[PDB]
Design an enzyme around this catalytic site. Structure first.
Site, PDB file in Angstrom:
ATOM      1  N   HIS A  95       0.830  -1.200   0.000  1.00 29.15           N
ATOM      2  CA  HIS A  95       0.000   0.000   0.000  1.00 29.15           C
ATOM      3  C   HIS A  95       0.865   1.251   0.000  1.00 29.15           C
ATOM      4  O   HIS A  95       0.692   2.146  -0.835  1.00 29.15           O
ATOM      5  CB  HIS A  95      -0.907  -0.001   1.229  1.00 29.15           C
ATOM      6  CG  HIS A  95      -1.859   1.148   1.290  1.00 29.15           C
ATOM      7  ND1 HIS A  95      -3.115   1.098   0.734  1.00 29.15           N
ATOM      8  CD2 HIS A  95      -1.728   2.391   1.806  1.00 29.15           C
ATOM      9  CE1 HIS A  95      -3.731   2.247   0.937  1.00 29.15           C
ATOM     10  NE2 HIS A  95      -2.907   3.052   1.578  1.00 29.15           N
ATOM     11  N   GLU A  96       1.792   1.336   0.951  1.00 28.95           N
ATOM     12  CA  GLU A  96       2.582   2.553   1.104  1.00 28.95           C
ATOM     13  C   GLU A  96       3.511   2.760  -0.077  1.00 28.95           C
ATOM     14  O   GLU A  96       3.801   3.907  -0.445  1.00 28.95           O
ATOM     15  CB  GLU A  96       3.404   2.506   2.393  1.00 28.95           C
ATOM     16  CG  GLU A  96       2.594   2.387   3.619  1.00 28.95           C
ATOM     17  CD  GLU A  96       1.616   3.525   3.800  1.00 28.95           C
ATOM     18  OE1 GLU A  96       1.872   4.665   3.351  1.00 28.95           O
ATOM     19  OE2 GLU A  96       0.569   3.262   4.406  1.00 28.95           O
TER      20      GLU A  96
ATOM     21  N   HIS B 150       1.614   4.566  -2.772  1.00 30.62           N
ATOM     22  CA  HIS B 150       1.735   6.003  -2.565  1.00 30.62           C
ATOM     23  C   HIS B 150       3.110   6.489  -3.011  1.00 30.62           C
ATOM     24  O   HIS B 150       3.235   7.516  -3.679  1.00 30.62           O
ATOM     25  CB  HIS B 150       1.501   6.382  -1.108  1.00 30.62           C
ATOM     26  CG  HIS B 150       0.089   6.232  -0.650  1.00 30.62           C
ATOM     27  ND1 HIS B 150      -0.951   6.941  -1.208  1.00 30.62           N
ATOM     28  CD2 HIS B 150      -0.439   5.550   0.397  1.00 30.62           C
ATOM     29  CE1 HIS B 150      -2.070   6.644  -0.572  1.00 30.62           C
ATOM     30  NE2 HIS B 150      -1.785   5.813   0.412  1.00 30.62           N
TER      31      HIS B 150
ATOM     32  N   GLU C 207      -6.233   7.862  -1.212  1.00 31.80           N
ATOM     33  CA  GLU C 207      -6.392   6.577  -0.534  1.00 31.80           C
ATOM     34  C   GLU C 207      -7.270   5.627  -1.345  1.00 31.80           C
ATOM     35  O   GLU C 207      -6.967   4.434  -1.456  1.00 31.80           O
ATOM     36  CB  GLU C 207      -6.983   6.770   0.875  1.00 31.80           C
ATOM     37  CG  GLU C 207      -6.106   7.555   1.856  1.00 31.80           C
ATOM     38  CD  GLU C 207      -4.771   6.880   2.147  1.00 31.80           C
ATOM     39  OE1 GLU C 207      -4.687   5.640   2.054  1.00 31.80           O
ATOM     40  OE2 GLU C 207      -3.812   7.599   2.490  1.00 31.80           O
TER      41      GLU C 207
HETATM   42  O1  LIG Z   1      -4.014   4.281   5.869  1.00 33.23           O
HETATM   43  C1  LIG Z   1      -3.251   5.216   6.083  1.00 33.23           C
HETATM   44  C2  LIG Z   1      -2.760   6.124   4.983  1.00 33.23           C
HETATM   45  S1  LIG Z   1      -1.405   5.312   4.106  1.00 33.23           S
HETATM   46  N1  LIG Z   1      -2.767   5.518   7.275  1.00 33.23           N
HETATM   47  C3  LIG Z   1      -2.951   4.693   8.314  1.00 33.23           C
HETATM   48  C4  LIG Z   1      -4.019   3.940   8.753  1.00 33.23           C
HETATM   49  C5  LIG Z   1      -3.563   3.325   9.914  1.00 33.23           C
HETATM   50  C6  LIG Z   1      -4.354   2.389  10.753  1.00 33.23           C
HETATM   51  C7  LIG Z   1      -4.389   2.557  12.131  1.00 33.23           C
HETATM   52  C8  LIG Z   1      -5.133   1.685  12.917  1.00 33.23           C
HETATM   53  C9  LIG Z   1      -5.856   0.652  12.320  1.00 33.23           C
HETATM   54 CL1  LIG Z   1      -6.829  -0.480  13.327  1.00 33.23          CL
HETATM   55  C10 LIG Z   1      -5.831   0.497  10.935  1.00 33.23           C
HETATM   56  C11 LIG Z   1      -5.083   1.369  10.152  1.00 33.23           C
HETATM   57  N2  LIG Z   1      -2.280   3.700  10.143  1.00 33.23           N
HETATM   58  N3  LIG Z   1      -1.895   4.585   9.124  1.00 33.23           N
HETATM   59 ZN   LIG Z   2      -2.725   4.975   2.234  1.00 31.59          ZN
END
Ligand SMILES: O=C(CS)Nc1cc(-c2ccc(Cl)cc2)n[nH]1
Ligand SMILES: [Zn+2]
Length: 388
Positions: A210-211, A214, A236
């Site tokens: 995923h990252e 980006h 996203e």
């Molecule tokens: O999804 C993103 C943008 S790349 N950021 C993200 C989401 C999370 C995250 C935090 C907590 C849970 Cl349960 C699931 C996803 N951390 N960072």
């Molecule tokens: Zn993301």
């Protein structure tokens, strides 16, 4: 045993099986600094890609501490050397896992090729690097050298669960959205992961992938402004793919193409006007970005953007390189939309081959765990998942 080379003699993307304790050497194990911090020991896992097995207290001056003010904290995490070695190995394994798939080879190739443009000059006839697309690499004898790179994987800040792909901005330039691109830093941990509901855990190769998606967008300067949202941002939804991406606005994606097609023609016009550089021939750097952007060259040496190669490159980065397509190549279970993450955070250890392999992730072939995604079922395979 880690199982980092399940087929062949050597890993196919990461250049050495590093140990955190390996000696510095100024080449691929080194103390580095981010252009003021304290030198940090880093590992160069591939051309243009460095791994910092440390908590991130460097990128944001406002995030220099690891205590609390959807989240999880722990200042103990990643403070000892065994940990830094476990993380360096976990990140390694996952690169190999991603590169073990056709889609991951495509994606990592694109990333390495995406050198951040040399737009750092205030003279339109002059190519020049932007020095925030660089790290300084200390040698054994104590000297620095400035080295360009595309991608840094670093540990998380105070909020261990917050994973993101961020980068340094320019006073006047929006580097992630004008085609130039810039050096991307991914706050990531291979040591924890997310739950989704049967109560399963997200495969960390998917999350790293995923990252990286980006990182691809941002390296070619075709990211969607984070102000465009539904909050879930368009960027996203694009990166997730699948049916989430359909909800992006219609023709405004077709706006996005035209915008960045033009941004690529502005870059091509800049390369043509280039008459000086501040070593490496002006010829050589012009070619570098010819290769990057798939620019055409005529018998005369003028650069331009072919509409069709633009389309194929911008289709590759925005629609093919998605989380959902990785789920499909990995044949793992994943949440079905960007939001269906329930709040379960698990400690994991993917480095032991007995726990998770380059080819199968947790769903270990010819075992209990190979059917119905058992290896990802936090209760069946509770051995591999500690709830927090
Ligand atoms: O999804 C993103 C943008 S790349 N950021 C993200 C989401 C999370 C995250 C935090 C907590 C849970 Cl349960 C699931 C996803 N951390 N960072
Ligand atoms: Zn993301």
């Amino acid at each position: 045993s880690s199982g980092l080379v399940p087929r062949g003699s050597h890993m196919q993307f990461v250049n050495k099986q590093f140990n955190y304790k390996d000696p510095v050497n100024g080449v691929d194990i080194a103390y580095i600094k981010i252009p003021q911090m304290q030198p940090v020991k880093a590992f160069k896992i591939h051309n243009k890609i460095w791994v910092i097995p440390e908590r991130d207290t460097f990128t944001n001056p406002e995030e220099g501490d690891l205590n609390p003010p959807v989240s999880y904290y722990d200042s103990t995490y990643l403070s000892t050397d065994n940990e830094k070695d476990n993380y360096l190995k976990g990140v390694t394994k996952l690169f190999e896992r991603i590169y073990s798939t056709d889609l991951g080879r495509m994606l990592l190739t694109s990333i390495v090729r995406g050198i951040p443009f040399w737009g750092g000059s205030t003279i339109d006839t002059e190519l020049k690097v932007i020095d925030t697309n660089c790290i300084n690499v200390i040698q054994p004898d104590g000297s620095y050298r400035s080295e360009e790179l595309n991608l840094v994987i670093i540990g998380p800040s105070a909020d261990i669960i917050q994973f993101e792909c961020k980068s340094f901005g320019h006073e006047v330039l929006n580097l992630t959205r004008n085609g130039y691109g810039s050096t991307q830093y991914i706050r990531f941990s291979p040591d924890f992961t997310f739950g989704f509901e049967g109560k399963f855990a997200t495969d960390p190769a998917v999350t790293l992938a995923h990252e990286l998606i980006h990182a691809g967008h941002r390296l070619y300067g075709i990211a969607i402004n984070p102000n465009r949202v539904f909050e879930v941002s368009f960027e996203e939804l694009r990166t997730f793919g699948g049916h989430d991406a359909k909800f992006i606005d219609s023709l405004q994606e077709n706006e996005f193409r035209l915008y960045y097609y033009n941004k690529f023609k502005d870059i091509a016009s800049t390369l043509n006007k280039a008459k000086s550089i501040v070593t490496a021939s002006l010829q050589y750097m012009k070619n570098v970005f010819k290769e990057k952007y798939l620019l055409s060259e005529d018998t005369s040496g003028k650069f331009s953007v072919d509409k069709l190669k633009f389309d194929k490159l911008y289709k590759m980065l925005t629609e093919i390189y998605t989380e959902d397509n990785f789920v499909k190549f990995f044949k793992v279970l994943n949440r079905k939309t960007y939001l269906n993450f329930d709040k379960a955070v698990f400690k994991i250890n993917i480095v032991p081959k007995v726990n998770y392999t380059i080819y199968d992730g947790f769903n270990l072939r010819n075992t209990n765990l190979a059917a119905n995604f058992n290896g990802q079922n936090t209760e069946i395979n509770n051995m591999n998942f500690t709830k927090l």
